């Protein structure tokens, strides 16, 4: 099963050569800024969504067991 975001460009020819379907799919998808989410038999291809509501709040002094973070 699939759910894939659309794109604006159209190719006139494209060649897949001596690679698997999964690998070919990954190369082509990144080139367009998309992320692949696989869940319970469905493959969903979408742009990052940073706009939705948080599911919950996780707090250092109340609910966190372990934590690791980095800035570079």
């Amino acid at each position: 099963e699939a759910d894939v975001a659309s794109t604006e460009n159209q190719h006139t020819e494209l060649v897949q050569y001596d690679v698997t379907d999964w690998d070919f799919m990954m190369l082509r998808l990144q080139a367009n800024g998309l992320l692949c989410l696989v869940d319970d038999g469905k493959v969903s291809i979408q742009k990052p969504d940073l706009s939705s509501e948080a599911l919950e709040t996780v707090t250092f002094g109340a609910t966190i067991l372990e934590f690791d973070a980095e800035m570079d």
Partner: protein, 225 residues
């Protein structure tokens, strides 16, 4: 037969259902232990986060049980009812070890044990033993010895699930008494009041806000996939 002093017995078995006796595999003591002791352990999971004042401790599992007791062997000749033997306690200890310790080539293991004395009935296996020899005849025949023993507990896996009658997965029925409401009964059976419209549809109820006080209802389980 109240007045009879009962003596402790140990029998060896071949199968995990305890129905097929080992031939010549029964030991009877000549002196009873003074006391015996049990041990019980329950384990919980106690992880908590920093900054908090308590943890809601969680059930993990129940550990196996343990029995311990001590024995005395003596053939000196001052205990009423018994005779002095030519070889002392040599055949008493050799028969005791054949029952509880020795490897059985028919089953590739030591024996299953059942221990019975009065109210006590215990099934399991031997873990530990120490035997200390105390008195001797001049030619080196022993006439007194002391033994300490530790027994573990055995449950067969088919009997564990029958004793843990584990029951939102099974079906249920109740009879309506006066004072009952449908959302309060749904909360006590499922843990949530929100399933009351599915219980009413499975019973053909239209006026579920007033229940009549002789009705028998069914409570179906929740679907799994």
């Amino acid at each position: 037969s109240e007045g009879k002093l009962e003596k402790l017995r140990i029998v060896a078995y071949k199968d995990s259902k305890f129905s097929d006796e080992v031939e010549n595999g029964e030991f009877i003591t000549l002196l009873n232990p003074e006391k015996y002791k049990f041990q019980y352990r329950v384990e919980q999971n106690e992880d908590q986060a920093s900054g908090t004042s308590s943890a809601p401790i969680r059930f993990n599992k129940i550990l196996p049980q343990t029995l311990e007791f001590d024995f005395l062997f003596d053939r000196t000749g001052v205990i009423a009812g018994y005779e002095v033997t030519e070889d002392g306690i040599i055949n008493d200890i050799d028969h005791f070890k054949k029952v509880v310790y020795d490897y059985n080539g028919e089953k590739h293991k030591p024996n299953y044990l059942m221990i019975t004395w009065g109210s006590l009935l215990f099934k399991g296996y031997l873990k530990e033993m120490d035997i200390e020899y105390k008195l001797f005849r001049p030619d080196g025949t022993p006439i007194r010895a002391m033994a300490t023993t530790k027994i573990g507990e055995f449950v067969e896996e088919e009997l564990r699930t029958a004793q843990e009658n584990n029951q939102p997965d099974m079906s249920h029925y109740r009879t309506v008494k006066e004072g009952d409401t449908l959302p309060l009964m749904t909360y006590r059976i499922y843990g949530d009041s929100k399933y009351y419209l599915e219980v009413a549809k499975a019973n053909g109820l239209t006026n579920f806000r007033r229940l009549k006080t002789g009705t028998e209802l069914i409570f179906p389980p929740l679907q799994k996939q």
